[PDB]
Design an enzyme around this catalytic site. Structure first.
Site, PDB file in Angstrom:
ATOM      1  N   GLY B 228       2.476  -5.064   1.332  1.00 30.27           N
ATOM      2  CA  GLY B 228       2.128  -3.971   0.448  1.00 30.27           C
ATOM      3  C   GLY B 228       0.780  -3.372   0.812  1.00 30.27           C
ATOM      4  O   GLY B 228       0.294  -3.500   1.941  1.00 30.27           O
ATOM      5  N   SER B 229       0.132  -2.766  -0.184  1.00 30.53           N
ATOM      6  CA  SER B 229      -0.922  -1.803   0.094  1.00 30.53           C
ATOM      7  C   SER B 229      -2.228  -2.433   0.552  1.00 30.53           C
ATOM      8  O   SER B 229      -3.139  -1.691   0.919  1.00 30.53           O
ATOM      9  CB  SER B 229      -1.200  -0.916  -1.125  1.00 30.53           C
ATOM     10  N   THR B 230      -2.359  -3.761   0.545  1.00 35.72           N
ATOM     11  CA  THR B 230      -3.489  -4.355   1.263  1.00 35.72           C
ATOM     12  C   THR B 230      -3.454  -3.988   2.748  1.00 35.72           C
ATOM     13  O   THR B 230      -4.501  -3.992   3.407  1.00 35.72           O
ATOM     14  CB  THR B 230      -3.486  -5.871   1.108  1.00 35.72           C
ATOM     15  N   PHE B 231      -2.255  -3.728   3.294  1.00 37.29           N
ATOM     16  CA  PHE B 231      -2.076  -3.373   4.709  1.00 37.29           C
ATOM     17  C   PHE B 231      -2.674  -2.004   5.037  1.00 37.29           C
ATOM     18  O   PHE B 231      -2.908  -1.698   6.221  1.00 37.29           O
ATOM     19  CB  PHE B 231      -0.574  -3.405   5.044  1.00 37.29           C
TER      20      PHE B 231
END
Ligand SMILES: *C(=O)[C@@H](NC(=O)c1c(-c2ccccc2)noc1C)[C@@H]1N[C@@H](C(=O)O)C(C)(C)S1
Ligand SMILES: *C(=O)[C@@H](NC(=O)c1c(-c2ccccc2)noc1C)[C@@H]1N[C@@H](C(=O)O)C(C)(C)S1
Lengths: 505, 505
Positions: B228-231
């Protein structure tokens, strides 16, 4: 997501391990699932649902209703009791037409024979997050990289399921009769080294997981034993090739004094001056200590090393134990002549014994027939007969075989309980003390013995070698001492010979 | 007997695993044991014996007498309840002076902290025959050749038990609150890459063996996630270094149409033309897809490989998963920009994240400080800080850190629940769908998310990186979506910073 894990086969193509679809029970309990529907899509009566579910999953209605009453939850599962359910379980759950109840397909590893060569096949474990399977013991672990995927490769074993049944049944009988702390039996093709059957007790059921972890060690490759008097055959072979053994020559039996220890024959008093052949039939310890003197201590140690002892056989099993030749002083040296102090693995014993029936050539035991992918048809590995070394000449091998014949069939034999009506049998008996794990002595008790038999049949030209061992009978220990493993050797060997079409007479 | 198995230590020399002496209960029940004796050497009163033993071992007196009545047995044991007894139990049984009762010493593997970094330390299992211990998971398995003996070598970990305590307590709270299917937290030294603490749920207790086997996979090294958006921080770094990201430049938010899928910003409608900096603070998916167009998809794929994704970090853990960059079509490429389709391990995420605080240098995470023999003093291995690669310049790293600051502290932040009173925090939130193990697509349900936070503090010049992830809350799934892992990040980070002597404001 996960590729199909490859299968494990026996030597005739029967499935020993494979992937299958099973089912997991899910219960939706949130009203929100039924907002748009006329018929409810959530559990409306938790008590009735629990009562009906308890007739399929192994859980009391009270624990089911407790799990159904969890707050702030959309859907619930039921732990291990609610997973790994069969297709028939799924059918009977679905016929109840319980609102909110469904079954999710999941992949499980299936072992069709249940508890069957378990410490050889091993067990693959599932990561619930991904479904990824990983072998934790035996073939599933050794060949994990090939088995896992496309599609993983298949591993074909040399095991014959028909012979394996004979071994599993005989070992069950030994557990009932003697409740031993350890127990193994192995059947090897005497002319190729293929392991045709192998089992041990206690063990686990790879299908259910029952008892997995209670004993990590495979007896054949990873456990070590002080072999006792089966080990005398290699001392005999050596003494024969060196000219120290003459079957008709007399020797003084009774006892020997070694570093302040009195080591005596098993009847304490011996039999006077008797021929060496009779001493071997009697399993005279003084004979073996005498022959060791005649050969010389340095030479005998090299002899045991040429028979493969003290070294791994380099099999495909992980963490194979090397064992150890106990040679640090004369007392250790002399007790090694009858299989005490020295430790061996059963696979070393099989390798060493095969020399006597292959013109002096030791055969490297093996149990993996092939590793190969059924889709690509690539063969990664193919097992084969391989000579581990030739410690003795063909002439020495025959003279050993003559003495093994006499052990069972001599008119003065003390091993007639290993005879099988209709078949000619030969081999060597063993009874040994067992090292206490903790503290520096032997297990204490009335008959605290590892008892064993290295047998082969038909005699002189065998089809199989059967080696069975029993450590520390907790029940009927006196009879365990008297009869050894004969109540396991006889059913295994007789049924195996019949199945291999050896004619009785 | 077995050589003493080496110890596992934490970074301050606290014992995590060691060999200890325990005791096994034995009852001699055959009268024959007392033939020659002026005192009975066997259990003469079965009821009094069973009643008195129930005050020490955890067994009903009725069961104890049942086992005391086994026939044709010299002595009996009492299963799992009768072993692993402490020296104090030994004292209490022995002052009872029960005829026939003794205690045998046995060596057991002792984990003084119980359920504590369990999936990292692992568990050693005992062979009852020999006492031989073999590691079955984690450090006990990885270094089993060193740990087993003489005396085995010691393994010293980088783990700090004081920080580990904070992680275990925080994870217990998340289980109580959210009952997730999977959960992990890891604390890494931001300047050295040392793992100071690591835990996961569910897990096992290496002391008792409870639940050992239900999940073989270590989350840090062996489990993969769609992050998810940690990437997004890595796509941001790429766009910064390529000159595609300018914090004040406008872009069109809202949604994008990719191969028949509508990919929207999280509020469906977007925010119109907004600055790129604000889009990153809002965690705009359209920003990330726009930046990927600007850089170019081939080049972005190289960028992720330059951050270590898709390949193992080559750590010391067995079977490290490589993950995969999902790039097989434009839909996968675009969804990978915000952390879907691509799969990562947590250790790859830490490695990639360390670049922003070490002037563009990724630090290879590590958890083994030393392997060394305490007797010979031989050092077999010494861990150290090692650069995994330098994907970005120091200038790019600083600009990324500025956006990570804003995510948490901007006056328009949607992550204010990660703030800690007295400490300055920065990081990036994630919420992702979870791939179903069987059948295609994503897990279904009202909030079926892997939620996570990649955090560091003090901001700009952090002491630690704390990465925490929670997959598939089964309770309070709505709150798990709203608050993510903030109820674990805040206690872990605050307690760690205080313990590391960072002064609060
Ligand atoms: C080889 O195994 C030999 N066994 C022993 O000498 C022996 C014993 C022992 C037990 C009971 C009575 C006498 C000896 N305990 O440890 C050892 C090493 C000989 N062969 C055995 C056999 O089973 O063939 C015996 C019992 C005949 S003695
Ligand atoms: C990155 O994690 C982004 N998440 C998603 O777009 C996303 C969602 C989703 C769930 C619920 C509501 C909206 C979107 N499901 O899968 C994905 C990949 C953005 N960041 C998240 C964050 O927590 O920062 C969100 C919720 C702001 S969207």
């Amino acid at each position: 997501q996960q590729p199909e894990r490859g299968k494990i086969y026996d030597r005739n193509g029967k499935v020993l391990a494979e992937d299958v679809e099973r089912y997991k029970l899910v219960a939706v309990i949130d009203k929100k699932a039924s907002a748009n529907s006329k018929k409810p899509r959530h559990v409306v009566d938790k008590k009735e649902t629990a009562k009906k579910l308890s007739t399929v999953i192994d859980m009391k209605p009270e624990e089911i209703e407790k799990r159904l009453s969890q707050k702030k939850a959309f859907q619930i599962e039921f732990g291990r009791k609610g997973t790994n359910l069969t297709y028939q379980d799924k059918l009977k759950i679905e016929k109840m037409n319980l609102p909110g109840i469904s079954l999710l397909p999941e992949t499980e590893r299936f072992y069709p024979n249940g508890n069957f060569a378990s410490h050889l096949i091993g067990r693959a474990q599932k990561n619930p997050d991904t479904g990824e399977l990983k072998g934790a013991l035996g073939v599933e672990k050794i060949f994990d990289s090939y088995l896992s995927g496309k599609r993983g490769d298949d591993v074909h074993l040399t095991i014959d399921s028909n012979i394996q049944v004979f071994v599993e049944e005989a070992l069950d009988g030994m557990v009932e009769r003697y409740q031993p702390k350890d127990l193994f039996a192995v059947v090897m093709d005497a002319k190729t080294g293929e392991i045709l059957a192998y089992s041990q007790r206690p063990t686990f059921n790879p299908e259910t997981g029952k008892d997995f972890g209670k004993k990590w060690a495979n007896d054949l490759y990873q456990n070590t034993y002080e072999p006792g008097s089966t080990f005398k055959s290699y001392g005999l072979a050596a003494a024969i090739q060196e000219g120290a053994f003459d079957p008709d020559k007399k020797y003084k039996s009774g006892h020997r004094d070694i570093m302040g220890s009195r080591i005596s024959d098993w009847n304490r008093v011996g039999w006077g001056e008797i021929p060496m052949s009779l001493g071997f039939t009697y399993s005279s310890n003084t004979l073996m200590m005498h022959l060791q003197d005649l050969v010389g201590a340095d030479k005998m140690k090299s002899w045991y090393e040429r028979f493969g002892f003290g070294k791994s056989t380099k099999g495909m099993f992980d963490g194979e134990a090397p064992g150890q030749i106990g040679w640090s002083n004369e007392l250790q040296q002399k007790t090694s002549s009858f299989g005490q102090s020295t430790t061996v693995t059963p696979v070393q014993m099989l390798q060493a014994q095969s020399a006597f029936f292959n013109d002096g050539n030791m055969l490297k035991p093996w149990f993996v027939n092939s590793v190969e992918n059924p889709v690509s048809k690539r063969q990664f590995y193919k097992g084969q007969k391989q000579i581990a070394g030739k410690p003795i000449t063909k002439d020495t091998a025959e003279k050993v075989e003559k003495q093994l014949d006499l052990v069972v069939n001599s008119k003065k034999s003390h091993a007639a309980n290993y005879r099988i009506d209709g078949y000619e049998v030969e081999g060597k008996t063993g009874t040994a003390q067992v090292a206490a794990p903790n503290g520096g002595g032997y297990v204490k008790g009335p008959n605290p013995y590892f008892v064993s038999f290295m047998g082969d049949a038909p005699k002189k030209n065998p089809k199989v070698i059967v080696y069975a061992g029993m450590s520390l009978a907790q029940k009927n220990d006196q009879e365990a001492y008297e009869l050894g493993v004969s109540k396991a050797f006889k059913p295994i060997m007789e049924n195996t010979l019949k199945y291999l079409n050896v004619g009785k007479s």
